[PDB]
From a paper:
Bloodstream T. brucei parasites express two papain family cysteine proteases, rhodesain (brucipain, trypanopain), a cathepsin L-like enzyme and TbCatB, a cathepsin B-like enzyme. RNA interference of TbCatB is able to rescue mice from a lethal T. brucei infection. TbCatB may therefore represent the more promising target for novel cysteine protease inhibitors targeting T. brucei infection. TbCatB has an ‘occluding loop’, a unique feature of cathepsin B-like enzymes, which spans the prime side of the substrate binding site and distinguishes them from the cathepsin L-like enzymes.
The TbCatB•CA074 complex crystallized in spacegroup P21 with two molecules in the asymmetric unit and was refined to 1.60Å resolution to a final Rfree of 17.8% and Rfactor of 14.7%. Chains A and B comprise residues 78–335 and 78–337 of full-length TbCatB, respectively. While a number of hydrogen bonds are formed between residues lining the substrate-binding site and the inhibitor backbone, a number of hydrophobic residues also provide binding energy, principally in the S2 subsite, the subsite that confers selectivity for this class of enzyme. This is in contrast with the TbCatB•CA074 complex where hydrogen bonding between the enzyme and inhibitor dominate over hydrophobic interactions. In our structure Asp258175 and Asp327244 are available for binding and in each copy of TbCatB interact with a glycerol molecule from the cryoprotectant solution. In TbCatB, the loop is three residues longer than in mammalian homologs and we note a dual peptide conformation between His 194110 and His195111. The corresponding motif in TbCatB, “FNFD”, lacks this flexibility and both Phe208121 and Phe210123 stack with the N-terminal residue (Phe189105) of the occluding loop, creating a more stable opening around S1′.
Residue numbers in the entry: 78 to 335
The structure:
């Protein structure tokens, strides 16, 4: 990783982590945590999962209860993180938050509308397959220019790897970004603990880790996807935990809001 690897203190290391955990239950006064994102018809998962977690950490660590960090700013402005709507790099996203900073979604609201991701929408959202969205130009003022820019930064960023690092980081500091290999069987997930069994490789996908538990003897992670609440289990999926299912334990990205 381009990031330094997380080191836990002796006290953090010996915490006896519970058999289940849910970020929204751990920090009930942090309203961003249960909010599910919609990346729209743009391959910006890397920036949306990052911004969502950054928002959550503003509340779990940074003393700010309800600031939504702008995924739009990240995806348009961190040209070196990757290629905007054509995908990008979670670790570089967190580094940018530390080196450069991000405005809120009040300053720069997400530029792309709700759409239905691999299903028919009860809300009446058009299918994402109908939209042709390029990366927007980076803007350095608010969309409404009478709103003053407030640039938010982290003071440090770091990488996590493996089941214990993930559980322990989540327990102490709250949601963070992870990535995994998407196969076609993931797309129609609705319930259960996901495990890859069929379907072709479709690409890498970055998502926000929020909890863990065990369901009928099967350990899992609880993950917030970015495909709105109509996908999966109210916008979430559970996925197997412990043997890096689809690579999901191979690398997490995090940091600490100032
Ligand atoms: C991650 C990403 O955005 N992935 C895509 C995605 O979720 N999309 C594309 C169109 C809307 C939405 C959808 O499928 O409903 C897609 C390739 C998943 C099948 C992005 O590609 C990226 O940055 N990946 C690298 C992460 C390390
Ligand atoms: Mg001690």
């Amino acid at each position: 990783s381009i990031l330094p690897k997380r080191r836990f203190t002796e006290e953090e290391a010996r915490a006896p982590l519970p058999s289940s955990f849910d970020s929204a239950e751990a920090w009930p006064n942090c309203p961003t945590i249960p909010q599910i994102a919609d990346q729209s018809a743009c391959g910006s998962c890397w920036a949306v999962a990052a911004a969502s977690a950054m928002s959550d950490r503003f509340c779990t660590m940074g003393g700010v209860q309800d600031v939504h960090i702008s995924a739009g700013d990240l995806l348009a402005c961190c040209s070196d993180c990757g290629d905007g709507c054509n995908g990008g790099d979670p670790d570089r996203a967190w580094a940018y938050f530390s080196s450069t900073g991000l405005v809120s979604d009040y300053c720069q609201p997400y530029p792309f509308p709700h759409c239905s991701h691999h299903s028919k929408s009860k809300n009446g959202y058009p299918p994402c397959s109908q939209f042709n969205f390029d990366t927007p130009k980076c803007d350095y003022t608010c969309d409404d220019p009478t709103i003053p820019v407030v640039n938010y930064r982290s003071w440090t960023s770091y990488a996590l790897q493996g089941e214990d690092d993930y559980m322990r980081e989540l327990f102490f500091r709250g949601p963070f970004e992870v990535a995994f290999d998407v196969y076609e069987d993931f797309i129609a997930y609705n319930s259960g603990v996901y495990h890859h069994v069929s379907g072709q490789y479709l690409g890498g996908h970055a998502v926000r880790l929020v909890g863990w538990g065990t369901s009928n003897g099967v350990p899992y992670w609880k993950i917030a996807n970015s495909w709105n609440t109509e996908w999966g289990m109210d916008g979430y999926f559970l996925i197997r935990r412990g043997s890096s299912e689809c690579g999901i334990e191979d690398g997490g990205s995090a940091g600490i809001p100032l």
